[PDB]
Amino acid sequence: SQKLVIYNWGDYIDPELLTQFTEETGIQVQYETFDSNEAMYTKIKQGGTTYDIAIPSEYMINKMKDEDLLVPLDYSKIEGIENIGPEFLNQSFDPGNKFSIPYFWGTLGIVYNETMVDEAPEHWDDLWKLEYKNSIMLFDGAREVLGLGLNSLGYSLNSKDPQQLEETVDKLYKLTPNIKAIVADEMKGYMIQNNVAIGVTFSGEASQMLEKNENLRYVVPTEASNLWFDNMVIPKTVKNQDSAYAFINFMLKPENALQNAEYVGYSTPNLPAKELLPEETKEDKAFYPDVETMKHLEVYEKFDHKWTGKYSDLFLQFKMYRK
Ligand SMILES: [Ca+2]
Numbered sequence: 001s002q003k004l005v006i007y008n009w010g011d012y013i014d015p016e017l018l019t020q021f022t023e024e025t026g027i028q029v030q031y032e033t034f035d036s037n038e039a040m041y042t043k044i045k046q047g048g049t050t051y052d053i054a055i056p057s058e059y060m061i062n063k064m065k066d067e068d069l070l071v072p073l074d075y076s077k078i079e080g081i082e083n084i085g086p087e088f089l090n091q092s093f094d095p096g097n098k099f100s101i102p103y104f105w106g107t108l109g110i111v112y113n114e115t116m117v118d119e120a121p122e123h124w125d126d127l128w129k130l131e132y133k134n135s136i137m138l139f140d141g142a143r144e145v146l147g148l149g150l151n152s153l154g155y156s157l158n159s160k161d162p163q164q165l166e167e168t169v170d171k172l173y174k175l176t177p178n179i180k181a182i183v184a185d186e187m188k189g190y191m192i193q194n195n196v197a198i199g200v201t202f203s204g205e206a207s208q209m210l211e212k213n214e215n216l217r218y219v220v221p222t223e224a225s226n227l228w229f230d231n232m233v234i235p236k237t238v239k240n241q242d243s244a245y246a247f248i249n250f251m252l253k254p255e256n257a258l259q260n261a262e263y264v265g266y267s268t269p270n271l272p273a274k275e276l277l278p279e280e281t282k283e284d285k286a287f288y289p290d291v292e293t294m295k296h297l298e299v300y301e302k303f304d305h306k307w308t309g310k311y312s313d314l315f316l317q318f319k320m321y322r323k
Pocket residue numbers: 009010011012
Protein backbone atom coordinates (compact mmCIF):
# COMPACT_ATOMS: atom_id res chain seq x y z
CA SER A 1 0.00 0.00 0.00
CA GLN A 2 2.61 2.58 -1.11
CA LYS A 3 1.27 6.12 -0.97
CA LEU A 4 2.07 9.80 -0.94
CA VAL A 5 0.22 12.76 0.67
CA ILE A 6 0.85 15.99 -1.35
CA TYR A 7 -0.19 19.41 -0.09
CA ASN A 8 -0.21 21.99 -2.91
CA TRP A 9 -1.80 25.18 -4.10
CA GLY A 10 -5.06 24.67 -6.02
CA ASP A 11 -4.80 24.36 -9.82
CA TYR A 12 -1.03 24.00 -9.64
CA ILE A 13 -0.14 20.69 -11.26
CA ASP A 14 -1.19 18.89 -14.45
CA PRO A 15 -3.47 16.23 -12.95
CA GLU A 16 -2.32 13.77 -15.62
CA LEU A 17 1.15 13.86 -14.00
CA LEU A 18 -0.34 12.41 -10.77
CA THR A 19 -1.84 9.59 -12.83
CA GLN A 20 1.51 8.97 -14.61
CA PHE A 21 3.35 9.00 -11.29
CA THR A 22 1.01 6.40 -9.78
CA GLU A 23 1.13 4.18 -12.87
CA GLU A 24 4.91 4.34 -13.12
CA THR A 25 5.79 3.87 -9.45
CA GLY A 26 2.73 2.13 -8.00
CA ILE A 27 2.50 4.95 -5.42
CA GLN A 28 -1.05 6.18 -4.83
CA VAL A 29 -1.59 9.91 -4.31
CA GLN A 30 -3.76 11.47 -1.63
CA TYR A 31 -4.02 15.08 -2.87
CA GLU A 32 -4.73 18.03 -0.60
CA THR A 33 -4.96 21.69 -1.62
CA PHE A 34 -4.57 25.06 0.04
CA ASP A 35 -5.02 28.54 -1.48
CA SER A 36 -3.12 30.86 0.84
CA ASN A 37 0.18 30.91 2.68
CA GLU A 38 -1.58 31.33 5.98
CA ALA A 39 -3.95 28.34 5.52
CA MET A 40 -1.06 26.06 4.60
CA TYR A 41 1.09 27.18 7.54
CA THR A 42 -1.69 26.59 10.06
CA LYS A 43 -2.31 23.01 8.90
CA ILE A 44 1.42 22.14 8.78
CA LYS A 45 2.21 23.77 12.18
CA GLN A 46 -0.77 22.01 13.79
CA GLY A 47 1.22 18.77 13.27
CA GLY A 48 -1.74 16.38 13.34
CA THR A 49 -2.09 15.95 9.58
CA THR A 50 0.45 13.89 7.70
CA TYR A 51 1.99 15.58 4.64
CA ASP A 52 4.87 14.00 2.71
CA ILE A 53 5.39 16.76 0.12
CA ALA A 54 4.29 20.40 0.34
CA ILE A 55 4.74 23.22 -2.18
CA PRO A 56 5.36 26.44 -0.15
CA SER A 57 6.36 29.92 -1.30
CA GLU A 58 9.81 31.28 -0.48
CA TYR A 59 8.26 33.43 2.33
CA MET A 60 6.88 30.31 4.00
CA ILE A 61 10.11 28.33 3.59
CA ASN A 62 11.88 31.08 5.54
CA LYS A 63 9.21 30.78 8.26
CA MET A 64 8.99 27.00 8.47
CA LYS A 65 12.68 26.17 8.41
CA ASP A 66 13.17 28.46 11.40
CA GLU A 67 10.45 26.56 13.32
CA ASP A 68 12.03 23.18 12.46
CA LEU A 69 9.03 22.09 10.42
CA LEU A 70 10.96 20.77 7.37
CA VAL A 71 13.14 17.73 6.82
CA PRO A 72 16.63 18.45 5.45
CA LEU A 73 16.69 16.84 1.97
CA ASP A 74 18.82 13.73 1.42
CA TYR A 75 20.52 14.46 -1.90
CA SER A 76 21.83 10.89 -2.09
CA LYS A 77 18.18 9.93 -2.82
CA ILE A 78 17.61 12.75 -5.34
CA GLU A 79 18.10 12.28 -9.06
CA GLY A 80 18.29 15.11 -11.57
CA ILE A 81 19.15 18.12 -9.41
CA GLU A 82 21.52 19.10 -12.23
CA ASN A 83 18.39 19.91 -14.25
CA ILE A 84 17.60 22.96 -12.12
CA GLY A 85 19.29 26.10 -13.36
CA PRO A 86 22.01 27.54 -11.15
CA GLU A 87 20.25 30.89 -11.08
CA PHE A 88 17.40 29.22 -9.13
CA LEU A 89 19.52 27.58 -6.43
CA ASN A 90 21.28 28.71 -3.26
CA GLN A 91 18.94 31.60 -2.63
CA SER A 92 18.59 33.62 0.54
CA PHE A 93 15.46 31.80 1.76
CA ASP A 94 17.17 28.35 1.67
CA PRO A 95 20.96 28.59 1.40
CA GLY A 96 22.48 25.44 -0.12
CA ASN A 97 18.99 24.13 -0.89
CA LYS A 98 19.09 22.35 2.44
CA PHE A 99 15.29 22.04 2.57
CA SER A 100 13.78 22.77 -0.83
CA ILE A 101 13.86 22.36 -4.61
CA PRO A 102 12.34 24.82 -7.06
CA TYR A 103 8.93 23.91 -8.51
CA PHE A 104 8.03 27.10 -10.43
CA TRP A 105 9.56 30.60 -10.28
CA GLY A 106 8.76 34.09 -11.38
CA THR A 107 8.98 37.82 -11.00
CA LEU A 108 7.11 41.03 -10.03
CA GLY A 109 6.43 43.22 -13.06
CA ILE A 110 4.04 45.21 -15.14
CA VAL A 111 0.94 43.86 -16.92
CA TYR A 112 -0.39 46.27 -19.55
CA ASN A 113 -2.99 46.48 -22.24
CA GLU A 114 -1.10 47.08 -25.52
CA THR A 115 -4.12 48.79 -27.06
CA MET A 116 -4.53 51.29 -24.16
CA VAL A 117 -0.95 52.59 -24.00
CA ASP A 118 1.19 54.30 -26.63
CA GLU A 119 4.71 52.99 -26.13
CA ALA A 120 4.93 49.93 -23.88
CA PRO A 121 6.21 50.40 -20.36
CA GLU A 122 9.74 48.92 -19.88
CA HIS A 123 11.00 50.31 -16.55
CA TRP A 124 9.58 51.17 -13.15
CA ASP A 125 10.03 54.92 -13.91
CA ASP A 126 7.72 54.58 -16.93
CA LEU A 127 4.81 54.22 -14.44
CA TRP A 128 5.31 57.92 -13.50
CA LYS A 129 4.61 59.17 -17.04
CA LEU A 130 2.04 61.90 -17.49
CA GLU A 131 0.05 59.81 -19.97
CA TYR A 132 -0.87 57.27 -17.31
CA LYS A 133 -3.20 59.53 -15.28
CA ASN A 134 -5.68 57.30 -13.33
CA SER A 135 -4.45 54.28 -15.37
CA ILE A 136 -2.55 52.02 -12.95
CA MET A 137 -3.46 49.48 -10.33
CA LEU A 138 -0.81 48.51 -7.76
CA PHE A 139 -0.48 45.22 -5.92
CA ASP A 140 -1.62 45.68 -2.30
CA GLY A 141 1.59 44.89 -0.46
CA ALA A 142 4.23 46.92 1.35
CA ARG A 143 7.27 45.00 0.14
CA GLU A 144 6.01 45.05 -3.44
CA VAL A 145 5.22 48.80 -3.59
CA LEU A 146 8.11 50.08 -1.47
CA GLY A 147 10.35 47.68 -3.38
CA LEU A 148 9.43 49.00 -6.81
CA GLY A 149 9.86 52.57 -5.52
CA LEU A 150 13.31 51.65 -4.18
CA ASN A 151 14.21 49.98 -7.47
CA SER A 152 13.05 53.05 -9.42
CA LEU A 153 15.68 55.06 -7.46
CA GLY A 154 18.49 52.50 -8.01
CA TYR A 155 18.16 51.10 -4.48
CA SER A 156 17.77 47.54 -3.30
CA LEU A 157 14.24 46.24 -2.60
CA ASN A 158 15.71 45.00 0.70
CA SER A 159 17.04 48.43 1.82
CA LYS A 160 17.39 49.14 5.53
CA ASP A 161 18.59 52.72 4.94
CA PRO A 162 16.14 55.24 6.43
CA GLN A 163 17.14 57.93 3.96
CA GLN A 164 16.55 55.59 1.01
CA LEU A 165 13.11 54.76 2.39
CA GLU A 166 12.24 58.45 2.91
CA GLU A 167 13.27 59.16 -0.69
CA THR A 168 11.16 56.18 -1.85
CA VAL A 169 8.00 57.42 -0.09
CA ASP A 170 8.50 60.93 -1.55
CA LYS A 171 8.88 59.35 -5.04
CA LEU A 172 5.74 57.18 -4.59
CA TYR A 173 3.74 60.28 -3.66
CA LYS A 174 4.49 61.58 -7.17
CA LEU A 175 2.91 58.43 -8.65
CA THR A 176 -0.50 59.08 -7.07
CA PRO A 177 -2.00 60.98 -10.03
CA ASN A 178 -1.60 57.71 -12.03
CA ILE A 179 -2.94 55.23 -9.48
CA LYS A 180 -6.56 54.18 -9.98
CA ALA A 181 -6.48 51.73 -7.08
CA ILE A 182 -4.42 49.51 -4.78
CA VAL A 183 -5.67 45.91 -4.97
CA ALA A 184 -4.37 42.29 -4.81
CA ASP A 185 -6.08 39.25 -6.38
CA GLU A 186 -9.09 41.26 -7.74
CA MET A 187 -6.73 43.14 -10.08
CA LYS A 188 -7.21 40.41 -12.68
CA GLY A 189 -10.87 41.33 -13.34
CA TYR A 190 -10.03 44.97 -14.01
CA MET A 191 -7.29 43.96 -16.51
CA ILE A 192 -9.22 41.15 -18.22
CA GLN A 193 -12.32 43.33 -18.73
CA ASN A 194 -10.27 46.20 -20.21
CA ASN A 195 -11.15 48.57 -17.35
CA VAL A 196 -7.58 49.68 -16.61
CA ALA A 197 -4.40 50.04 -18.74
CA ILE A 198 -1.66 48.92 -16.36
CA GLY A 199 -1.28 46.72 -13.33
CA VAL A 200 1.72 45.90 -11.15
CA THR A 201 1.59 42.26 -10.13
CA PHE A 202 3.37 38.93 -10.16
CA SER A 203 4.18 36.85 -13.23
CA GLY A 204 1.95 33.89 -12.34
CA GLU A 205 -1.04 36.19 -11.90
CA ALA A 206 -0.03 37.90 -15.14
CA SER A 207 0.24 34.59 -16.98
CA GLN A 208 -3.36 33.74 -15.97
CA MET A 209 -4.65 37.20 -17.08
CA LEU A 210 -2.91 36.99 -20.43
CA GLU A 211 -4.66 33.65 -21.14
CA LYS A 212 -8.01 35.45 -20.82
CA ASN A 213 -7.26 38.66 -22.75
CA GLU A 214 -5.14 38.66 -25.94
CA ASN A 215 -4.44 42.36 -25.58
CA LEU A 216 -2.50 42.05 -22.34
CA ARG A 217 1.30 41.88 -22.14
CA TYR A 218 3.77 41.46 -19.28
CA VAL A 219 7.22 42.93 -18.78
CA VAL A 220 9.88 42.59 -16.12
CA PRO A 221 11.90 45.80 -15.62
CA THR A 222 15.44 44.88 -16.57
CA GLU A 223 17.03 47.18 -13.99
CA ALA A 224 15.68 45.33 -10.94
CA SER A 225 12.68 43.48 -9.68
CA ASN A 226 11.51 40.80 -7.25
CA LEU A 227 12.16 37.06 -7.70
CA TRP A 228 9.71 34.50 -6.20
CA PHE A 229 9.73 30.73 -5.92
CA ASP A 230 7.29 27.95 -5.06
CA ASN A 231 9.33 24.88 -3.96
CA MET A 232 9.01 21.25 -3.07
CA VAL A 233 9.72 20.43 0.60
CA ILE A 234 9.27 17.38 2.90
CA PRO A 235 7.44 18.41 6.06
CA LYS A 236 8.57 16.81 9.33
CA THR A 237 5.17 15.06 9.62
CA VAL A 238 6.17 12.93 6.64
CA LYS A 239 5.15 9.25 6.92
CA ASN A 240 6.09 8.07 3.40
CA GLN A 241 9.65 9.30 2.87
CA ASP A 242 10.51 6.86 0.05
CA SER A 243 7.40 8.10 -1.77
CA ALA A 244 8.35 11.76 -1.24
CA TYR A 245 11.75 11.25 -2.84
CA ALA A 246 10.15 9.29 -5.67
CA PHE A 247 7.86 12.26 -6.36
CA ILE A 248 10.68 14.80 -6.24
CA ASN A 249 12.64 12.66 -8.69
CA PHE A 250 9.59 12.28 -10.97
CA MET A 251 9.10 16.09 -11.06
CA LEU A 252 12.79 16.67 -11.80
CA LYS A 253 12.56 14.61 -15.02
CA PRO A 254 12.57 17.18 -17.80
CA GLU A 255 9.60 15.63 -19.64
CA ASN A 256 7.48 15.99 -16.47
CA ALA A 257 8.67 19.51 -15.68
CA LEU A 258 7.95 20.37 -19.34
CA GLN A 259 4.42 18.93 -19.27
CA ASN A 260 3.74 20.71 -15.99
CA ALA A 261 4.94 24.07 -17.32
CA GLU A 262 2.78 23.73 -20.42
CA TYR A 263 -0.27 22.94 -18.30
CA VAL A 264 0.09 25.55 -15.53
CA GLY A 265 1.72 28.10 -17.85
CA TYR A 266 4.36 29.30 -15.41
CA SER A 267 8.16 29.52 -15.77
CA THR A 268 10.05 26.32 -15.28
CA PRO A 269 13.36 26.25 -13.37
CA ASN A 270 14.27 23.01 -15.25
CA LEU A 271 16.71 24.08 -17.97
CA PRO A 272 16.55 20.97 -20.14
CA ALA A 273 12.73 21.21 -20.05
CA LYS A 274 12.84 24.85 -21.13
CA GLU A 275 14.76 23.85 -24.30
CA LEU A 276 11.91 21.52 -25.34
CA LEU A 277 9.09 24.10 -24.97
CA PRO A 278 7.34 25.67 -27.96
CA GLU A 279 9.48 28.45 -29.47
CA GLU A 280 6.96 31.19 -28.66
CA THR A 281 6.96 30.21 -25.02
CA LYS A 282 10.69 29.69 -24.58
CA GLU A 283 11.63 32.95 -26.28
CA ASP A 284 9.12 35.12 -24.42
CA LYS A 285 11.15 37.52 -22.34
CA ALA A 286 7.97 38.29 -20.31
CA PHE A 287 8.49 34.91 -18.58
CA TYR A 288 12.03 33.77 -19.49
CA PRO A 289 13.80 37.13 -19.17
CA ASP A 290 17.41 37.62 -20.23
CA VAL A 291 20.59 36.91 -18.15
CA GLU A 292 21.11 40.55 -17.12
CA THR A 293 17.50 40.93 -16.01
CA MET A 294 17.88 37.72 -13.98
CA LYS A 295 21.07 38.99 -12.33
CA HIS A 296 19.26 42.14 -11.23
CA LEU A 297 16.41 40.29 -9.52
CA GLU A 298 16.27 40.04 -5.70
CA VAL A 299 14.33 37.77 -3.40
CA TYR A 300 12.64 39.58 -0.46
CA GLU A 301 14.73 39.36 2.68
CA LYS A 302 13.11 38.20 5.90
CA PHE A 303 13.00 41.32 8.04
CA ASP A 304 12.90 41.33 11.83
CA HIS A 305 9.97 42.87 13.78
CA LYS A 306 11.50 46.36 13.48
CA TRP A 307 12.00 46.46 9.74
CA THR A 308 8.72 44.61 8.98
CA GLY A 309 7.03 47.38 11.00
CA LYS A 310 8.99 50.17 9.36
CA TYR A 311 7.97 49.01 5.87
CA SER A 312 4.37 48.49 7.00
CA ASP A 313 4.22 51.99 8.49
CA LEU A 314 5.71 53.54 5.36
CA PHE A 315 3.10 51.86 3.16
CA LEU A 316 0.35 53.18 5.45
CA GLN A 317 1.87 56.67 5.03
CA PHE A 318 1.55 56.22 1.28
CA LYS A 319 -2.09 55.07 1.55
CA MET A 320 -2.91 58.13 3.72
CA TYR A 321 -1.54 60.46 1.04
CA ARG A 322 -3.78 58.75 -1.55
CA LYS A 323 -6.86 59.95 0.39
CA1 LIG B 1 -4.33 28.39 -8.02
